[PDB]
Amino acid sequence: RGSFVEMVDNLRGKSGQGYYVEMTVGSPPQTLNILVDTGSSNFAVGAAPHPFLHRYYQRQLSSTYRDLRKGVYVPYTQGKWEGELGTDLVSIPHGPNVTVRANIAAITESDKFFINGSNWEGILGLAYAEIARPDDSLEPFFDSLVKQTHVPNLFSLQLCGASVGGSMIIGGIDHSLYTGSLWYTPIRREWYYEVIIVRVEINGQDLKMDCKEYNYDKSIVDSGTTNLRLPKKVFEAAVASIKAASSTEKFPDGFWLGEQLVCWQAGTTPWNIFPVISLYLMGEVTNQSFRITILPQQYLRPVEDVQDDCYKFAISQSSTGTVMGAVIMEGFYVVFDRARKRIGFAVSACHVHDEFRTAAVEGPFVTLDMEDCGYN
């Protein structure tokens, strides 16, 4: 409880490529780097010599592998994977000192899935059974962990943005990782980590949309997506406020659609011209909310593959609802308190800020009719 020094700093990554944790699978153990993803529910690992992979799971080496004799085919918007299901012993070296028999999907064919040049070779789907493929009787990793050990039913994430690293605390919260207080929002349904956004401000000016728009058709917290994604109508209104608040300079409008990069001379990006963005989330108590505030440092992402200082606009339009991706999460320490069905936010002790502004988590606020904000 409250102090897990062996787990601090157990995540790594590179800009644009996500945050991964070291895992071992099988007997004797095979070490793999595995992307941490709160937006999906399968533990799936490269199991064949795909040319982009540093390492892959070799079932034939594991004396503890058991075949489930069932294939899985998983298409996404961008690309797909398919593989073969089994179970094996899994452990997290910089994690609790336990071993668990978990489901693993051994990926034997994929397309647009692995990143050329990245250092991970599998994905740890940390969300619930309801979105597991092929169906909800395939128990997710973290459910197996809790069922089989005395690890408490919660984990927390601190993602430190730009090389990147962070911490995933399995079984607890580490208080040195955040400042001020944790504020909690209810998990509305256990499938994704679905939450309810009740109001949206751009430099403290309310968007004034019906709040049901903010959650059309859901809002989720997703470490496996880079951007803040917003439902289309909300995106349209948010950009229009961001441009106004910022029209102290004039950028190519393709910039706002994420279609072109913008660059300044190294040394001073003018952060001060860009507004803060606040999301009010449903609180624990009737008619009570709290608000989280992110900076341009979070939503303007450095792009490194080209001489000066180039950024991509990292808020984008969505058709799958609001996605609070690594753009939101890098401001906060986020607690996935599955035992009490709630998600905690606090200011991260590592978030990227300047001398004038920081990220913020503040409450309570009085917000009426917060249940009307959910979409059915």
Exactly one of 104, 196, 242, 326 binds ligand 1H8 (CB under 6 A); that residue is 326
- In the annotation, is 369 catalytic? no
Q: For tokens 């001398």, what's the residue? A: 355
**Binding site partner of 175, from Na ion, ligand 1H8, none, Cβ cut-off 5-8 A by kind:** Na ion
> Least distance (Å) from ligand 1H8 to the CB of residue 227?
9
Convert 5-27 to b/e letters by CB count within 10 Å (16 or more is b): eebbebbbbbebebbbbbbbbbe
Taking CB under 6 A as the binding criterion, the range among 33-41, 57-65, 98-106, 356-364 that sits at the site for ligand 1H8 is 33-41
Q: Tell me, residue by residue from 197 to 236, as one string, x for binding to ligand 1H8 by CB under 6 A and - for no binding.
A: -------------------------x-xxx----------
Using DSSP's 3-state secondary structure scheme, residue 142 falls into helix
CA distance 277 to 20: 27
Tokens describing residue 346: 């606090």
| Binding status of residue 316 toward ligand 1H8 by CB under 6 A | no
| Binding status of residue 17 toward ligand 1H8 by CB under 6 A | yes
Output 75 or 270, the one with its CB closest to ligand 1H8.
75
Convert 335-344 to b/e letters by CB count within 10 Å (16 or more is b): bbbbeeebbb
Output 175 or 232, the one with its CB closest to Na ion.
175
Output 103 or 225, the one with its CB closest to ligand 1H8.
225
CA distance 219 to 211: 12
Exactly one of 18, 95, 171, 344 binds ligand 1H8 (CB under 6 A); that residue is 18
For residue 28, say if its preceding peptide bond is cis, omega within 30 degrees of 0: yes
Q: Is the dihedral of CA 297, 5, 334, 101 positive or negative?
A: positive
**Cα torsion at 252, 253, 255, 261 (round to 10°)?**
-20
Footprint of Na ion (CB under 5 A): 175, 178
Which position among 37, 88, 174, 337 bears the catalytic label? 37
Q: Measured at the alpha carbon of residue 234, what is the angle toward residues 132 and 129, in degrees to the nearest 5? A: 10
Output 65 or 178, the one with its CB closest to Na ion.
178
Q: Tell me, residue by residue from 79 to 118, as one string, x for binding to ligand 1H8 by CB under 6 A and - for no binding.
A: ----------------------------------x-x---
Using DSSP's 3-state secondary structure scheme, residue 92 falls into coil
The interface with ligand 1H8 within residues 48-67 (CB under 6 A) comprises none
Which position among 143, 174, 222, 337 bears the catalytic label? 222
**Binding site partner of 224, from ligand 1H8, Na ion, none, Cβ cut-off 5-8 A by kind:** ligand 1H8
Cβ neighbours of residue 31 under 8 Å, at least 6 residues apart? 22, 23, 24, 55, 93
**Binding site partner of 326, from ligand 1H8, Na ion, none, Cβ cut-off 5-8 A by kind:** ligand 1H8
Exactly one of 24, 30, 33, 40 binds ligand 1H8 (CB under 6 A); that residue is 40
Q: For tokens 């990782």, what's the residue? A: 177
Tokens describing residue 202: 């751009």
Are 285 and 364 within 8 A, CB to CB?
Answer: yes
**Cα torsion at 340, 343, 345, 349 (round to 10°)?**
90
Contacts to ligand 1H8 by CB under 6 A: 16-18, 35, 37, 39-40, 76, 113, 115, 123, 222, 224-226, 326
Any idea which residues carry the catalytic annotation? Answer: 37, 222
